[PDB]
Design a protein around this ligand. Structure first.
Ligand SMILES: Oc1cc(O)cc(/C=C/c2ccc(O)cc2O)c1
Ligand SMILES: Oc1cc(O)cc(/C=C\c2ccc(O)cc2O)c1
Ligand SMILES: [Mg+2]
Lengths: 229, 237
């Protein structure tokens, strides 16, 4: 591909971290723009972020061209990179294996994503989070990533599982000291050994390393978030 | 495609209907196995999915009645994944458009359905919550459509994903099914025939005209009957 690619995100957005991982896996040449400025309504009138501009002239990100195609919705941005760079095999080759990668993302979206938010941001009962974590965990093979090799599955879920672990280790979140104790114990137990290794293997992935600030930075960022208290 | 395809669904499931639409759009040779919602699910279904998940596809393996699933078939669940599977198996059907950008916009339209309207359909019709959010989400979805035609001009998986749900909620509305108050029902019915919602009204009848929808829908009267036997849709006395 030769069209210009520009990815827009807020600095520590997990949704934008999705698109950042996939552009890295793809070997793409792209501009990265972290931040809401007045100009941004030219990327998306609604202020939706993350966003990708595609095609048009090379432009500084804060001057998006009227010619470029503008795209939003993080999981569609994943599919987009995969489609633009088929040669990077961001998804596997067979339809069945692609179907399992997508099913795995749906498990995260439909079952775990909201309870992660209940347990860590709304201080709600933690029980359902751990069950949804297990359910996603159960869809992993004994080794490797969700469908064996790295795929959009990982781009989709990595930013969120890595932040969960970072928060739990750091005691950030709105859960009770009691529920926080219960989650630290679950994640360190054999029940959740598979998912814990998954995150470890995720965190070793070069595309994750590059698009993660480092634990230092993510932590400094984290400790300026209200909903984490 | 030479592999056998079998689609398992509880009857009248909008989730299974998604994949039905897509198999009909694809021109696929497929076997359709309907399970009764209100029975328990046959013991044999565990061989298609141990947790009883529907809808589900078996792919390949030997040719077998659906109640005799072969272990040699690959088994897939999750309706939005099943849509992308059919497109992947039948690329000549162009269930998604050709360019990455248009593909991305079709997938984004599915996201808007899921992020906003899907849960207000449940809240307003099955839980009886105030319906203002439901209208606003319908508007949000409506504003993502182009001036005419389908979400990305030509029909795509966007319609496979959203048609089963948009059609049932408009069916339920005109017939007054749901847990919402009777005032909120007149509010919704009035809003839907208003000019505010002309575009989404045009989208729904354009959906209902599509061959693949007609054949997988099997008529309003049988969808009404199916819905009058969903207990969660009944206001209590
Ligand atoms: O058998 C039927 C008939 C029908 O009309 C709708 C449904 C389900 C709708 C639904 C479920 C979960 C959710 O979060 C949101 C939803 O809209 C099932
Ligand atoms: O790779 C793909 C492609 C696609 O079209 C859909 C999905 C999955 C789930 C999904 C999408 C959007 C959303 O807001 C919620 C969802 O559950 C996965
Ligand atoms: Mg609600």
């Amino acid at each position: 591909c030769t069209e210009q690619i520009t990815l827009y995100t807020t600095t520590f957005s997990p949704y934008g971290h999705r698109a950042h991982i996939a552009l890295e896996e793809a070997g793409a040449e792209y501009t990265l723009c972290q931040i809401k400025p007045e100009w941004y309504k030219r990327v998306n009138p609604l202020g939706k972020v993350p966003a990708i501009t595609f095609g048009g002239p090379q432009v500084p990100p804060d001057e998006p061209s009227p010619e470029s195609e503008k795209l939003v919705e993080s999981l569609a941005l994943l599919e987009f990179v995969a489609d633009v760079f088929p040669e990077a095999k961001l998804l596997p080759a067979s339809p069945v294996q692609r179907a399992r990668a997508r099913a795995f993302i749906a498990i995260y979206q439909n079952y775990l994503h909201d309870q992660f938010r209940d347990a860590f941001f709304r201080g709600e009962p933690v029980g359902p989070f751990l069950q949804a974590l297990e359910t996603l965990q159960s869809a992993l093979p004994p080794a490797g990533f969700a469908v064996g090799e790295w795929s959009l599955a990982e781009a989709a879920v990595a930013p969120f599982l890595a932040r969960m672990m970072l928060y739990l280790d750091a005691g950030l979140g709105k859960y009770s000291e009691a529920d926080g104790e219960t989650m630290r114990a679950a994640l360190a137990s054999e029940r959740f050994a598979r998912i814990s290794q998954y995150v470890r293997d995720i965190r070793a992935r070069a595309s994750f390393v590059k698009s993660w600030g480092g634990d230092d930075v993510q932590l400094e960022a984290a400790k300026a978030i209200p909903m984490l208290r």
